[PDB]
Amino acid sequence: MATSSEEVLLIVKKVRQKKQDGALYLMAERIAWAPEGKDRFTISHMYADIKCQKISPEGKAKIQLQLVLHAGDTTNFHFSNESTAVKERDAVKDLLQQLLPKFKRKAN
Amino acid sequence: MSDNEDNFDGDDFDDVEEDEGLDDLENAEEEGQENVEILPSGERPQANQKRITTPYMTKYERARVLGTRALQIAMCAPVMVELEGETDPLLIAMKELKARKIPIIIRRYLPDGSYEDWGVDELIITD
């Protein structure tokens, strides 16, 4: 759904990125995050470019999804939905993580 | 705007590296004894065949049930036995265990991978 640029499978609301309050949308080929009130995703990472996904679980008042890229880069997506902030993380995790091998080397 | 994403240092990032489609490796274990499951009865999950083990309880299952029961009573669990001075979870649990008054299902496991459910009520505890 939310095919404004690509087919979004997982829509994660109340997500922030380094002082930017917005929303995270996982599309078929890329994880794109946009600011709340913006029609355009200011961040879009293809699962290919995402070298690894790290995620801070309960314990901290800040649940975060850090997309560590190949070069050593990263993308800090803070799940700030007081309701299911961590549960969001887990779903975005299980999904994105499964989205990765799709953009990784196959059996050969 | 929230400067909370730069107000941290050491985020407890539960590193999640995807790795699906890996090998099983049956040799990836260290146990080979009777690893039994200590479950609280009332739901009573049991199989539908004759059991192959013995309806007796040694110091293995006893101590396991006792430790788990002391943990229960230590949390203010109701006592199922008579009190003749027993004011400690261990004493009470020992009385309950010896009388099979402890409601707990002990699922035994064999080195072959099989498992059999065994309630304390079905086990003759030899102190």
UniProtKB/Swiss-Prot annotation, chain B:
Q: Which domain of life is it from?
A: Eukaryota
Question: Entry's SMART domains?
Answer: RNA_pol_Rpb6 (SM01409)
- Disordered: where is this region? 1-53
The protein's UniProt keywords, in alphabetical order, are: Acetylation, DNA-directed RNA polymerase, Nucleus, Phosphoprotein, Transcription
Recorded GO CC terms:
cytosol; fibrillar center; nucleoplasm; nucleus; RNA polymerase I complex; RNA polymerase II, core complex; RNA polymerase III complex
Annotated positions of the Phosphoserine modification: S2
Where is the secretion signal located? Answer: none
Renumbered to this chain, the Acidic residues biased-composition regions fall at: 1-34
Q: Which residues carry this modification: N-acetylserine?
A: S2
What Pfam family is a match for this entry? Answer: RNA_pol_Rpb6
Provide the protein's localization.
Answer: Nucleus; Nucleus, Nucleolus
One GO molecular-function entry: DNA-directed RNA polymerase activity
GO annotation (BP), single:
transcription by RNA polymerase II
UniProt family annotation: Belongs to the archaeal Rpo6/eukaryotic RPB6 RNA polymerase subunit family.
Give the protein's function: DNA-dependent RNA polymerase catalyzes the transcription of DNA into RNA using the four ribonucleoside triphosphates as substrates. Common component of RNA polymerases I, II, and III which synthesize ribosomal RNA precursors, mRNA precursors and many functional non-coding RNAs, and small RNAs, such as 5S rRNA and tRNAs, respectively. Pol II is the central component of the basal RNA polymerase II transcription machinery. Pols are composed of mobile elements that move relative to each other.
The subunit structure is: Component of the RNA polymerase I (Pol I), RNA polymerase II (Pol II) and RNA polymerase III (Pol III) complexes consisting of at least 13, 12 and 17 subunits, respectively. Pol I complex consists of a ten-subunit catalytic core composed of POLR1A/RPA1, POLR1B/RPA2, POLR1C/RPAC1, POLR1D/RPAC2, POLR1H/RPA12, POLR2E/RPABC1, POLR2F/RPABC2, POLR2H/RPABC3, POLR2K/RPABC4 and POLR2L/RPABC5; a mobile stalk subunit POLR1F/RPA43 protruding from the core and additional subunits homologous to general transcription factors POLR1E/RPA49 and POLR1G/RPA34.
Name this protein carries in UniProt: DNA-directed RNA polymerases I, II, and III subunit RPABC2
